[PDB]
C-alpha cells in the first residue's frame, strides 16, 4: 500500500556520466560506447563557425579520476558528439527515444559529472519540465527503463525565466519552441494533463480514497468543453482506451471518473485531500499507475 | 531553479540487493561485504506469525535452509546469527560492489531515500521522512520487506532503515540496520496501530525559507513571535513543538535570507490561520514537512 512519485533506479545511468570541459565551460556528458554526448553550448565563448575552429584536444573529458582522450568531434543538431578512444565498459543496453507531452521520465541531476539526485518528471504540454537544476547541471539526462533497456529521452540545456527547464532529445532536437542561446525566451502558457489526472484518481481509488466518486457519467464532448474552460488538455478516445485497464480494475468507467473530475474542477476539494494532495496531480501516466501497483522490477 | 523532492542516486545500493528465501517465504536482503542482512521474520511459518519465538525458530535452521540469490548467482550461506530483529547471513563471497557505508539510526523528522525492491530487484526510488510517530509513508507492496532507506551525503552510503511491515492505516514500520525498531512496534502480527501523527514544524519552516530563496515573499508579515507563543498556537494545529535546537538549526537559512527565525514563525502562524487563498508555495497547496534544513541547503 501507499502511492508515491517514484523514479527509476538510476544505477545504469550513473555509470555513464562524465565531465566535459571546453575552455572555461564545464558541464555534464553522457558516455555510451566510445562516444560522449553533451550540449553543443559547451563550445560557446555561429555554432558552425565555432566548431570548425575547434580541435579534438580542446575538449577535456573526465570519467571519475580518468581522463578520456578525444579523437573526433561532430555536431548533431544541438548535441556535440565527442568520439573517445575507450568504450564505456559500463554502457547499458540502451536506445535513444523522443517522448510526447504528458509522458514521464526520471532525471539524474549531475554536477561536474557527478550524479547528485534523481527525480521523476513529466514533459509538460508547453514542452518544459518542472525540474531542479542549478548552475552546472547542463547535460543531465532523463530516461525510462523497460525490462533491461534504458531509453534516453532528455538532455538538459537551460533554465527559462519562470524557473522551468528546457532541453533536447539525445539527437539534439529541442522539445518545444526554444533555442540554445542567451536570448529572450519564455514558456508558453501551460495546461494540465487530463489523462494523467484521471490515472491518478484511479490510483487514489485503488488506495481507498473514494469520497470524490459519484453516481454520474458524462460524454467526451460535454467533458471536453469543461476541460477547455479550466485549461485542461482535451481528452481523446485514445486516452479513454489507455485507461481501460484501470476502469476494469476499479469498476469506474472513464466517463464516470470524468464526472468526478468535472465536479472537482467546478467545486474544489471542500477541504479534503486525494493521496495526501490538495492539488490535482498530473505527472503520473496510466502506465505509471499500473507499473507501481504491479511491483514491476528492472 | 525549481524545487523537487529529490532522492539520492540509487546505484550504490542497487548493487547490494539480493533475494533471501527460507521455506516458502521470500524477501529482500542487503549484501555488504560477506554478510546479508534481512528481516528475521523470513523464518516465520504461516501457523506461527502472532507469537514467534525467533530464538527457537533459528536454532532449528541449517545454513542450507537459507537460499540467497544475487541476480543469477546463488550465494552459499556459511553461518547465521540474529541481532535484534535483523538476521545476518554470512556468505562465502564478499560483494565486490560493496560501497563505502555505515549504519546510522535516525531521529523523527529526518529524511532518506528508499529503494523499493521485489524478489531482490529494484523497482523505484523515492524520498521519505521518519514521522514523529515513527512510521514512514512509503510505497510497499507484498514482497517489499527488506527494502532499505539510505542517504549518500558525500560518497559514503548511510543505511538508516529496513522495511518490515505495514500498519492498518497504510503506513509502514521498520528497523535500523542493527535491527532495532523505530517506535514501539514489534515483528509480530498482533494488533498494532500508529500513534496520532503530527507535522514536522522545523521542516515546514525550512521549506518556507526555500520558498523565499526561490523568490516568493507573499506569505511574510510584519510580525514576530516568542518561541513559547508560537508553540502554544502551533500545538493547536497538531504541529510538533519547536525547540531552541530547531531555532539554532535554522540559523544558516535565516542568515542567507535575512529573515529571523521567529519572524518566519510568525509567518507560519498566519498561514495556519488563513490558508493560501488559492495560491501555492513551491508548487504545493499544503505546507510541506518532508524537507529538512539540511535538504534545503543541499538542493539550494
Ligand atoms: C553560443 N550561443 C550563440 C552563439 N553564436 O553563434 O554566436 S555561440
Ligand atoms: C534497448 N534494449 C535492448 C536493445 N537492443 O536492441 O540491443 S535497445
Ligand atoms: C547549459 N547547457 C546548454 C546551455 N545553452 O545555453 O544552450 S546552458
Ligand atoms: C497500487 N497497487 C496497490 C496499491 N495499494 O495501495 O495497495 S497502490
Ligand atoms: C532552493 N529552492 C529554490 C531554489 N532555486 O534555485 O530556485 S534553491
Ligand atoms: C563511510 N563510512 C565508512 C567509510 N570508510 O572510509 O571506511 S566512508
Ligand atoms: C513483509 N513481509 C512480511 C510481512 N508481514 O507483515 O507478514 S510484511
Ligand atoms: C513472522 N512472519 C510474519 C510476521 N509479521 O509480523 O509480519 S512475524
Ligand atoms: Cl448520469
Ligand atoms: Cl498539494
Ligand atoms: Na461519476
Short mmCIF file of C-alpha atoms and ligand atoms in Angstrom, two decimals, chain B residues 41-45 48-50 52 54 164-165 186-190 192, ligand 8:
data_model
loop_
_atom_site.label_atom_id
_atom_site.label_comp_id
_atom_site.label_asym_id
_atom_site.label_seq_id
_atom_site.Cartn_x
_atom_site.Cartn_y
_atom_site.Cartn_z
CA UNK B 41 10.53 -12.78 10.15
CA UNK B 42 11.66 -14.61 6.99
CA UNK B 43 11.99 -17.63 9.30
CA UNK B 44 8.36 -17.43 10.44
CA UNK B 45 5.88 -20.11 9.40
CA UNK B 48 3.19 -19.05 13.99
CA UNK B 49 3.15 -15.39 12.94
CA UNK B 50 1.42 -13.98 16.04
CA UNK B 52 7.04 -16.38 17.04
CA UNK B 54 12.71 -16.42 16.95
CA UNK B 164 9.49 -4.86 7.97
CA UNK B 165 5.74 -4.36 7.93
CA UNK B 186 7.31 -5.42 17.05
CA UNK B 187 7.72 -8.05 14.32
CA UNK B 188 4.54 -9.92 15.23
CA UNK B 189 1.13 -9.96 13.53
CA UNK B 190 -0.67 -8.88 16.71
CA UNK B 192 -0.62 -2.67 16.36
C1 LIG C 8 6.52 -13.88 11.26
N1 LIG C 8 6.07 -13.82 9.99
C2 LIG C 8 5.46 -12.56 9.73
C3 LIG C 8 5.46 -11.69 10.81
N2 LIG C 8 4.92 -10.30 10.89
O1 LIG C 8 4.52 -9.90 11.97
O2 LIG C 8 4.92 -9.62 9.88
S1 LIG C 8 6.22 -12.42 12.16
#
